[PDB]
Amino acid sequence: RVKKVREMELIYARAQLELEVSKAQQLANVEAKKFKEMTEALGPGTIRDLAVAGP
Amino acid sequence: RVKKVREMELIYARAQLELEVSKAQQLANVEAKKFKEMTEALGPGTIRDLAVAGP
Numbered sequence: 001r002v003k004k005v006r007e008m009e010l011i012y013a014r015a016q017l018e019l020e021v022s023k024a025q026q027l028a029n030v031e032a033k034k035f036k037e038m039t040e041a042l043g044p045g046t047i048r049d050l051a052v053a054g055p
Numbered sequence: 056r057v058k059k060v061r062e063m064e065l066i067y068a069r070a071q072l073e074l075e076v077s078k079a080q081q082l083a084n085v086e087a088k089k090f091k092e093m094t095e096a097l098g099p100g101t102i103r104d105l106a107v108a109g110p
Contacts (some may be wrong), residue, residue: 007067013071013074020078024085035097036092036096040096044098047098047105048098051108054110055110
């Protein structure tokens, strides 16, 4: 018992935790690409100029 | 008893703790690559300029 319940637990636990990391990959891919489109068409120097304003 | 319950505990304990470190590897790979895409297209000198603003 303590072997075969707890080992099917290991195998399903794999099937679910490569799952949560897959969720993390995909959501962070969307965050990534949509910051990239954000900054690249906002302006490479525009972000510098807007943050360097300290007069 | 105290041998064969506690040694199947060792073997499953392996199967689960190389597991938690595998979870750590994969989640930290996504964190890694998506900071890399972050900084490299944000700008190598942009991060310096935005942090060096102290006027």
